[PDB]
């Protein structure tokens, strides 16, 4: 607990840019693309007001559009007079991927017709298209193979406080060990993280801060309409914050919280608000109506685990279950606790052979061990109970491929 | 119930079945079978023939049966076992876990086949476990898989009885003969004996 993330002071003009959404749609062969930027403002509305979205490729200015506020007619009452959408054309765009993180710079300027800048906001833009088609998860038209891992924001000395250095370190290690994706288990990550994954090249699963695995049944809260509000905000506020990052390719509704109506409601919300990304959720059996991807956790390669209500089918058998057609990517597999990862090769053998077995996310990146000191003042790795904490869950907080200090296992 | 149509000897295998000039001859071997046996309850599936690639004629005749008799599914392994001329993925000799990526007409692991992008049909091998001589090894693996996968609904072993003929030596004693044993040539050795039982119905 406490204030574990940066505290800032931001000054905005009275007449300001209150929000902007960046979208990129392409033709079938990705030779052309249209960048669409919806901009919303606050303050005094005036005709002399203008918004100019310009796309930059390095020092070059690939495209630029300007227009006054006043959106298109959306219903019988008219439209948003406090909004405007710019659409820029882009020929032969440099596509973004974890392989080649090609980025552009989108600069949103709030100004007056006579050319006076009021304020400007910006973001990195990555031209990439994510879509599930014919049972396959496609990134720019090609079917992905997620070589991912789950990563908790953990520091052996700073607790759950992140810093650029620790982040960049992890990212390098990951890419160095042939990883291309990460799952923000199990909450939105520190803002800098997305920026790094954007530039370094990593597919990200942005996951809402919602886990109630302790309830009984697991969906006692998520199915209760009384809790729809609290959940709603943990999903919607994540989307409104990170929706512009190209590294974010999938939205997750949270973790271990059974499958309640609330999940379905929020699932549909994201789909309405942001069609650009698939939504997934493993709760309730990994293949519920609240997920676009069959995302089990720890489902074995050939062996079935016929648990009642929420069985874990052999990933290979799962894909062909009557009626099923979705792509399957484990949200968690290969529990790397201690001397583990045995049978890991079997998973990949299968991933490569089955078109719709598109990978998974190992569990997990780093050991959640904390540093304590003995009488002599020497440091040592501590876990469950080592702090008088009780009840505690022994050493189950150490499931990483690397030790708290990022030393490989 | 399978129509009398096999042209495996042609090159490519569908040289005749894709030629409209042969649509008539084929048509009659399909339609006359249906008109004859369509009332038998034991007949649950109609087959368009065997080893004859995949020509337009197959598609035409496929649709005919579907129009004439909606009560039964139609199947055909020609052209890759999953063509537009079959309601069932019916490969022949496709292995359980191992793929055999032949060009044009590969034989995917039956388990991998069911989940291929877009695929949704049920899979029943029209021929598997070639029981030629001391064979049927790995048979248990097929069943292990049939039971675990809902859409892996079985198959048809190949085959029932040895196609051996009886000849007699100088003394007048009978013995089982096969390819070539009748001066027949060219012949294909003993490949006519692939049964689970000998010509005289004695179990193997
Ligand atoms: Na695959
Ligand atoms: Na854990
Ligand atoms: Na079955
Ligand atoms: Na034979």
* Exposed/middle/buried for residue A60 (C-beta within 10 Å: 0-12, 13-18, 19+): exposed
Residues of A in contact with B111 (CB under 8 A): 316-317, 320
User: A354 and B115: CB-CB below 8 Å?
Assistant: yes
Residue position matching structure tokens 């021929």 = B127
Residues 6+ apart with CB under 8 A from A16: A41, A42, A43, A110, A118, A119
Reduce the secondary structure of chain B to three states and give it as a string. Answer: CECCCECCCCCCCCCCCCCHHHHHHHHHHHHHHHHHHCCCCCCCCEECCECCCCCHHHHHHHHHHHHHCCCCCEECCCCCCCCCCCCCECCECCCCCCCECCCCCCECCHHHHHCCCCCCCCEEEEEECCCCCCCCCCHHHHHHHHHHCCCEEEEEECCCECCCEEEECCCCCEEEECCCCCCCCCCCCCCCCCCCECCCCCEC
CB atoms within 10 A of CB B47: 20
**Least CA distance to B148: which residue of chain A?**
A317
Q: Are strands A370-373 and A379-382 parallel, antiparallel or unpaired?
A: antiparallel
CA atoms A238, A150, A285, A142: torsion sign:
positive
Cβ pair A71, A55 in contact under 8 A: no
User: B111 and A320: CB-CB below 8 Å?
Assistant: yes
Query: Which tokens is A122 given?
Result: 């910006």
CB-based contact, B88 to chain A, within 8 Å: no
Residues 6+ apart with CB under 8 A from B184: none
Q: Report the C-alpha gap between B146 and A352 in whole angstroms.
A: 23
Q: Report the C-alpha gap between A386 and A176 in whole angstroms.
A: 33
Ion ligand 4, residues whose Cβ is below 5 A away: B 191, 194
Q: What is the dihedral of CA B56, B60, B62, B65, to 10 degrees?
A: -160
Residues of A in contact with B95 (CB under 8 A): none
Q: Report the C-alpha gap between A358 and B152 in whole angstroms.
A: 22
- In angstroms, what separates the C-alpha of B96 from chain A's closest C-alpha? 12
Domains of chain B: 1-204 (3.20.20.80)
Half-sphere exposure of A38 (CA within 13 A, CB side): 13
- Judged by phi (left if over 0) then psi (alpha if -120 to 50, else beta), residue A242 lies in alpha
Q: Report the C-alpha gap between B78 and B94 in whole angstroms.
A: 13
Residues 6+ apart with CB under 8 A from A269: A232, A235, A236
Ligand 1 center from residue A361 Cα (angstroms): 14
CB-based contact, A320 to chain B, within 8 Å: yes
Cβ pair A370, A386 in contact under 8 A: yes
**Catalytic residue chosen out of the listed positions B2, B8, B28, B51:** B51
Q: What is the dihedral of CA A42, A43, A46, A50, to 10 degrees?
A: -40
CB atoms within 10 A of CB A385: 13
Experimental method: X-ray
Half-sphere exposure of B95 (CA within 13 A, CB side): 9
Ligand 2 center from residue A397 Cα (angstroms): 4
Whats the size of chain B, residue-wise?
204
Cβ pair B165, B136 in contact under 8 A: no
Half-sphere exposure of B40 (CA within 13 A, CB side): 11
CB atoms within 10 A of CB A173: 17
β-bridge partners, B127: B92
Residue position matching structure tokens 């840019």 = A17
Question: What distances in angstroms separate CA A324 from CA A143, A285, A330, B121, one per listed residue?
Answer: 18, 14, 16, 11
Residue whose C-alpha is closest to residue A290's, from A267, A258, A322, A320 = A267
β-bridge partners, B107: B100
Window A:284-313, CB contacts with B under 8 Å: 304
Q: Report the C-alpha gap between B201 and A272 in whole angstroms.
A: 67
Residues of A serving a catalytic function are 256, 332
CB-based contact, A355 to chain B, within 8 Å: yes
* Exposed/middle/buried for residue A394 (C-beta within 10 Å: 0-12, 13-18, 19+): exposed
B51 is catalytic: yes
Residues 6+ apart with CB under 8 A from B148: A304, A314, A317
Ligand 3 center from residue B149 Cα (angstroms): 4
Query: Which tokens is B113 given?
Result: 């086949």
CB atoms within 10 A of CB B156: 14
Residue whose C-alpha is closest to residue A408's, from A81, A110, A179 = A179
**Least CA distance to B150: which residue of chain A?**
A321
Residues of A in contact with B120 (CB under 8 A): 323, 325
């Amino acid at each position: 607990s406490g204030i574990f993330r940066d505290v800032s002071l931001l000054h905005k003009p009275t007449t300001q840019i209150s929000d902007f959404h960046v979208a990129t749609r392409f033709n079938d062969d990705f030779s052309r693309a249209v960048l669409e930027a919806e901009v919303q403002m606050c303050g005094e509305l005036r005709d002399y007001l203008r918004v100019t979205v310009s796309l930059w490729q390095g020092e070059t200015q690939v495209a630029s559009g300007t227009a006054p506020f006043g959106g298109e007619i959306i219903d019988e009452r008219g439209g948003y007079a406090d909004r405007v959408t710019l659409r820029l054309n882009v020929e032969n765009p440099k596509l973004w991927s974890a392989e080649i993180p090609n980025l552009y710079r989108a600069v949103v300027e709030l100004h007056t017709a006579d050319g006076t800048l009021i304020e400007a906001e910006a973001c990195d833009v990555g031209f990439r298209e994510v879509r599930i088609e014919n049972g396959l998860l496609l990134l720019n038209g090609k079917p992905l193979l997620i070589r991912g891992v789950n990563r908790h924001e953990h520091h052996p000395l700073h607790g759950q406080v992140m810093d650029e250095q620790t982040m960049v370190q992890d990212i390098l290690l990951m890419k160095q060990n042939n990883f291309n994706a990460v799952r923000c288990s199990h909450y939105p990550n520190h803002p800098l993280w997305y920026t790094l994954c954007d530039r370094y090249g990593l597919y990200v699963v942005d996951e809402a801060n919602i886990e109630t695995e302790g309830m009984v049944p697991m969906n006692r809260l998520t199915d209760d309409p009384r809790w729809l509000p609290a959940m709603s905000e943990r999903v919607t506020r994540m989307v409104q914050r990170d929706r512009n990052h190209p590294s974010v390719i999938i939205w997750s509704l949270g973790n271990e919280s059974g499958h309640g109506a609330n999940h379905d409601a929020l699932y549909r919300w994201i789909k309405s608000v942001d069609p650009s990304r698939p939504v997934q959720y493993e709760g309730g059996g990994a293949d519920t109506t609240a997920t676009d991807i069959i995302c089990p956790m720890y489902a074995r390669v050939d062996e079935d685990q016929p648990f009642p209500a929420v069985p874990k089918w052999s990933i290979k058998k799962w894909l062909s279950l009557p009626g099923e057609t979705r792509p399957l990517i484990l949200c968690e597999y290969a529990h790397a606790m201690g001397n583990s990862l045995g049978g890991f090769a079997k998973y990949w053998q299968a991933f490569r052979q089955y078109p719709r077995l598109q990978g998974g996310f190992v569990w997990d990146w780093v050991d959640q061990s904390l540093i304590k000191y003995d009488e002599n003042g020497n440091p040592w790795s501590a876990y469950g109970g080592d702090f008088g904490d009780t009840p505690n869950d022994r050493q189950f907080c150490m499931n990483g491929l690397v030790f708290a200090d990022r030393t490989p296992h």
